[PDB]
């Protein structure tokens, strides 16, 4: 029954503060700078998630400035933001008020993995297609997420709508300006990140997305390990030993190191026999040593693996309509505009 009011600025629209009221506050998760709360907006009854972020008094918050300019059906929407105190004494925190999505792709993946069952391929196509759309959108701004993983893929299981979240590591990459290499989470780090490269591109998101696809097909992470050595061995066991030309494309400081000598394992034996060959073909074009050889997010959306989604008769397993898949904007298509031939089917 307790109603809380704060003055807050809308995530989008005019920079005009307004009174926002919320109730039914409850802890739902953990964050690096405080717990994450769920709340219910009084004006609309909509559920929101509130997370704390350390406000740097020197620079503008990178996560905030990125989220205020993003508007895409497969990206979590910033509703409001305001400042308050919190966990540490004498500290001012930035509060990000986000549309609440109850589940993640990881929860669905572990649900089938625990039951020793395969996630139905139609859900694999839907989740990965929506993920690549969100990547193509942010990459068109030059923004790299730098922390793609199943736990950061919000999911409404009823409508199968996916939304990318957690832009705390996101950065607009500028060629020629170095970046920290310690971003991205274990299992999902591109090999150039394992090699500590400071000169990398948005293609690290595509490698991480390839790791998500392989995990959804395998029922477990494809490149597990608690250290970079253990992760690299699992990568080499699949892709083979990287050639010196490939190491120079990742981090030329590592060209002369001693790596385990293993020939590549055939892609058709990495996954179970019944895995659809289009899914395997797509993974081989995402998990590539050479970053420029990986598909772009927009190229991945047009891959034959997602042809079933462009069927005019595609239906969800429960029977609902598939979510919005073809409402591409000029910004979203800017990396390859004439790709809308495949991406937008005739019935759209």
């Amino acid at each position: 029954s307790k109603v809380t009011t704060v003055v807050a600025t809308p995530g989008q629209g005019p920079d005009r503060p307004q009174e926002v009221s919320y109730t039914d506050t409850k802890v739902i998760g953990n964050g690096s700078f405080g717990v994450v709360y769920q709340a219910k907006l009084c004006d609309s009854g909509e559920l929101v998630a509130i997370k704390k972020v350390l406000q740097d008094k020197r620079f503008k918050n990178r996560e905030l400035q990125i989220m205020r300019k993003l508007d895409h059906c497969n990206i979590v929407r910033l509703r409001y933001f305001f400042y308050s105190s919190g966990e540490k004494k004498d500290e001012v925190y930035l509060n990000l008020v986000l549309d609440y999505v109850p589940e993640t792709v990881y929860r669905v993946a572990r649900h089938y993995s625990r039951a020793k069952q395969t996630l139905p391929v139609i859900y694999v196509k839907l989740y990965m297609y929506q993920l690549f759309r969100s990547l193509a959108y942010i990459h068109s701004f030059g923004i790299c997420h730098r922390d793609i993983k199943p736990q950061n893929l919000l999911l409404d299981p009823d409508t199968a709508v996916l939304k990318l979240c957690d832009f705390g590591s996101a950065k607009q990459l500028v060629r020629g300006e170095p970046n920290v290499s310690y971003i991205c989470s274990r299992y999902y780090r591109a090999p150039e990140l394992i090699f500590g490269a400071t000169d990398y591109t948005s293609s690290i998101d595509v490698w991480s997305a390839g790791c998500v696809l392989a995990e959804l097909l395998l029922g477990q992470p494809i490149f597990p390990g608690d250290s970079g050595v253990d992760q690299l061995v699992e990568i080499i066991k699949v892709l083979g030993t990287p050639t010196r030309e490939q190491i120079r494309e990742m981090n030329p400081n590592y060209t002369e190191f001693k790596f385990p000598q293993i020939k590549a394992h055939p892609w058709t034996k990495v996954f179970r026999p019944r895995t659809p060959p289009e899914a395997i073909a797509l993974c081989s074009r995402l998990l590539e040593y050479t970053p420029t050889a990986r598909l772009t997010p927009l190229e991945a959306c047009a891959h034959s693996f997602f042809d079933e989604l462009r069927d005019p008769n595609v239906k969800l397993p429960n029977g609902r309509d598939t979510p919005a898949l073809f409402n591409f904007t000029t910004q979203e298509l800017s990396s390859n505009p004439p790709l809308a031939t495949i991406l937008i089917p005739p019935h759209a």
């Binding site: 802890v27 739902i28 998760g29 109850p102 589940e103 993640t104 990881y106 929860r107 669905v108 572990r110 649900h111 736990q151 950061n152 299981p157």
Partner: peptide
């Protein structure tokens, strides 16, 4: 530990 939320329709907190 490895989950985003405490709660999920697929498991127990």
């Amino acid at each position: 530990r490895e989950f985003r939320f405490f709660y999920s329709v697929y498991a127990d907190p």
